[PDB]
Symmetry: D2
Amino acid sequence: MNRLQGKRALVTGGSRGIGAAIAKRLAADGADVAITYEKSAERAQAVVAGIEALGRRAIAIQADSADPVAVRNAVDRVAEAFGGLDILVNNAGIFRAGSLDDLTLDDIDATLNVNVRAVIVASQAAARHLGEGGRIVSTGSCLATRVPDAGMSLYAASKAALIGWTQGLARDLGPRGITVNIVHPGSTDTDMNPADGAHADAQRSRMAIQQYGKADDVAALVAFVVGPEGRSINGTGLTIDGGANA
Amino acid sequence: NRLQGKRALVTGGSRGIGAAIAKRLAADGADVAITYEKSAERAQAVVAGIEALGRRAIAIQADSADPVAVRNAVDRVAEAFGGLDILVNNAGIFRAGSLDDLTLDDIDATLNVNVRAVIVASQAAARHLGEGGRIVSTGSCLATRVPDAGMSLYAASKAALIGWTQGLARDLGPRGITVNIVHPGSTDTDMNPADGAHADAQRSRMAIQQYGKADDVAALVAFVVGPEGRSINGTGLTIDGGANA
Amino acid sequence: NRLQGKRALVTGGSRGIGAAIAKRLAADGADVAITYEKSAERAQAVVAGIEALGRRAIAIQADSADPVAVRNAVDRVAEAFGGLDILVNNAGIFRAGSLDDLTLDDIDATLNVNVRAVIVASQAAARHLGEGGRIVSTGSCLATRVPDAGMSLYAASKAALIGWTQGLARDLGPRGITVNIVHPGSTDTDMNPADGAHADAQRSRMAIQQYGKADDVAALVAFVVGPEGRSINGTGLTIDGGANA
Amino acid sequence: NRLQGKRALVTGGSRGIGAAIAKRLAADGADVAITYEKSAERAQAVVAGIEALGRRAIAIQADSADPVAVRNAVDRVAEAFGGLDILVNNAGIFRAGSLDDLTLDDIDATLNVNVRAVIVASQAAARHLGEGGRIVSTGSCLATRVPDAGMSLYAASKAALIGWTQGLARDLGPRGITVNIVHPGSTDTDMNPADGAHADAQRSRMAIQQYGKADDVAALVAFVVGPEGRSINGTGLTIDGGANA
Ligand SMILES: NC(=O)c1ccc[n+]([C@@H]2O[C@H](COP(=O)([O-])OP(=O)(O)OC[C@H]3O[C@@H](n4cnc5c(N)ncnc54)[C@H](OP(=O)(O)O)[C@@H]3O)[C@@H](O)[C@H]2O)c1
Ligand SMILES: NC(=O)c1ccc[n+]([C@@H]2O[C@H](COP(=O)([O-])OP(=O)(O)OC[C@H]3O[C@@H](n4cnc5c(N)ncnc54)[C@H](OP(=O)(O)O)[C@@H]3O)[C@@H](O)[C@H]2O)c1
Ligand SMILES: NC(=O)c1ccc[n+]([C@@H]2O[C@H](COP(=O)([O-])OP(=O)(O)OC[C@H]3O[C@@H](n4cnc5c(N)ncnc54)[C@H](OP(=O)(O)O)[C@@H]3O)[C@@H](O)[C@H]2O)c1
Ligand SMILES: NC(=O)c1ccc[n+]([C@@H]2O[C@H](COP(=O)([O-])OP(=O)(O)OC[C@H]3O[C@@H](n4cnc5c(N)ncnc54)[C@H](OP(=O)(O)O)[C@@H]3O)[C@@H](O)[C@H]2O)c1
């Protein structure tokens, strides 16, 4: 009777922000939910405790997205714990600020490893477990397709990479019945992008309706895509950005 | 109810995707008006089913090709329901034919029904919609990807709605009305039956080769115009089985 | 000559981007016809300059809003030149105004001139074009990205041409005719003067803040229709100073 | 000479599209450096041909997967030529294989060569480029449309360059340097031979079913970086025979 009755999900980067909202919403819709995190162990356990209080199974796994072995092992741990896997949400991500002149190799490698390679590795590992009706969603960005200012180029490249990955992976997994999609948030009130931050006025100015998005609304859209009326949504990008990309 | 008290107009709501949209908005709590061209009995059956849920519903005969009829239909719904919160521009036609055989009548009918009617209804709705109002149009996966011959006029008509949607989101931003487009792929309807002559070729283009359900297209429209869709704006949402991957 | 022996028609060739395209195709070797609506003096000056190069050239008054005039103009050029190799759909209008003030006349004029004329001329030209023929239309960076209010009808009309272009490339593929769209950004013309009141705002959207030259737009069109453009097909080429980045 | 006095670096210039670009920039008047990984004989033959035109040319073994080597290659060219005007990021790999079989070595090699090397070279070149400088990268029609299984890592690596290109155009706007991406479709090279096993399937996706010529891709790159390309910026130019229509 739950929209996600019996479903088994992993949300990377689920301790805070958009990922925590997604984890809570999938649980609210009926799924058992695992999350990964890098450092926020207390906050991750609190997400888990809240999901368990609903009567769901939940686990939090410390797994550095930059480490492909940790990512692959986290996916396998979820499938072992829950008996299988139905939903993967690749959400953990970083935004390294800086000018072109100042860009470091460490920032390039960190961004490509966390924002791109971890998505590829988790997707491949999840595909070993997912069956017909399984769902993969990744968190992109409105910046993947429209870059309004300087200082965003490395991040934009990392999110644009996920568009090609998503469309190709939908072809790879089509015969097995697994959909692959990307949700592109615009400005969304989180620790990465606080609505009271110094740059928030400029970000609101780009929107058609000038209001930061809610993480819970991004989560609602992810939950629709991975839910019982989302089966024909596949290989595509869904932008929730207040009209910034109009 | 997710759409408690909302007042909606779905053009071309007598059959197909539009009937599914009208039924879903009503199931979610909205009062729903539909237009139709000729299917008076089917339209009234849609209306009767919505009334049976306890909602208000009306069906207005209004030829999308006639811009006066379209504008009047929008105003008549606002009069009948007291206001208007949601406009879904869904009525559309697909005139089959080769480039060689393309007629002026087909060009005019397609542009008038699939484009001009959307512009006219959107403008009229903008005189009524308040803060939090929602406009959605039905596009097509063919608006951005055209796989074969014989689709060019139709693809042009749907691509036009992309520019309209993005610009209109800018126009209506200060008033707080979102404007979006939902692009179906192959969806089992009278226009595109899943047992039709072209249906194998259409399925072959998808990642998961099954025609879509009109009810799922309706579910996505209902999400966009609902209480968690306020930040979805100026954008296209494709539900096509992966055809455009 | 890059376009030695080629036979071209550029709609709206009396001034602006169209005149620049006409002059460049002629400079590259082509015989060139142009259409215009009212600017007989400026059209004749374009023709006289092309004739001074030694090419054939004609100017046809042909209202793009009249489908019969458009078809007949295409047929007249093919008859006069003995054939047709290149069609450039460039004539267009930009009706300024708010959504509230948008008139049915504005809607019809924009769809008729900016969309229907392109479809009609393309179909007419396809009766004359052969293997190696080329169709290009003038789009706009606004077709895919609309930054402000007041542009929605125009953006819709240019976005329509993307779907048309991609579908027509499929239609004409077996016959070896490419179909492409060039999307200018802010380009210094009577429609969009670089020293105008709103030109500062348009420059601010660009990466390099300088209006484009009509002659550079013409250079890109000339590349697409020339001897190294055969594999450019079904696509949009944007020349907008980075506005759409 | 359209590129009189210009000083260019083409990564992966020993074979294929890169060799064609290097040769075309030299034919247009530029001094040209190339990088290569292992084809020393081929690289020296490209250099010798350019020198026979009267231009300066150098070949540098520089593994794109090594960011220090990439940065050093850019600095070496700028030192040898006295400056730098044009950077073409062309070196790339396509690791064939299924999702099931994808290795971490494949993932790392593809991201290092196809993405990180472009970022590193672009940043290094920006220390030498001045007003009027040009950066172009070789993308792929697969960056935006993926028709089959087995392409997903590669498609991701080329899609990455679209976001890089648009963002870097913003970064380098105040300095007057344009940044663009040219997306070839099926182009007859060692990576994608026109008589290879998958070549029939690739031709079947096109509107005009013939593999592209590397020299035509080079001609389009040469246009973008030349004297009429100043307003082409932050954009993708696809040369794919209509595959992406
Ligand atoms: N907020 C926006 O406006 C916005 C807009 C567009 C896209 N996005 C994308 O949305 C996603 C979530 O962003 P957010 O705003 O919610 O960010 P956030 O507040 O910074 O939260 C980031 C989340 O990712 C986790 N994470 C980061 N690096 C990780 C690593 N190496 N290993 C494991 N987990 C890691 C964090 O774990 P810890 O708690 O342990 O640090 C946390 O759970 C990201 O992909 C971001 O790029 C955000
Ligand atoms: N089915 C697909 O695979 C597909 C895919 C992409 C996009 N679409 C789009 O989805 C929309 C609905 O398509 P559908 O498949 O549901 O089509 P359908 O089965 O042919 O239903 C068409 C609906 O539009 C109405 N309509 C058509 N022309 C009209 C006019 N001149 N005035 C008033 N109403 C008019 C019809 O009214 P009557 O009942 O009175 O005739 C009917 O309610 C269209 O915009 C279509 O282009 C469909
Ligand atoms: N300028 C820009 O910034 C810009 C940017 C993007 C796209 N565009 C597009 O580029 C194209 C050319 O624009 P432009 O800036 O060169 O404009 P322009 O200076 O206004 O010239 C318009 C041309 O189109 C002709 N024309 C207009 N309506 C016509 C009709 N009904 N019948 C026949 N010819 C007609 C005009 O003929 P008359 O001389 O007889 O009036 C003239 O030759 C248009 O499609 C426009 O939308 C322009
Ligand atoms: N061919 C097509 O159909 C097609 C279509 C779309 C995009 N592309 C792209 O076009 C570009 C050129 O492709 P192509 O078809 O000409 O390929 P190719 O025949 O395989 O030539 C590849 C070139 O890149 C160089 N290269 C590769 N890896 C390198 C590395 N680690 N360090 C330095 N140089 C390296 C090669 O050097 P060595 O000679 O030393 O090996 C060679 O010069 C690539 O980015 C490719 O992805 C090709």
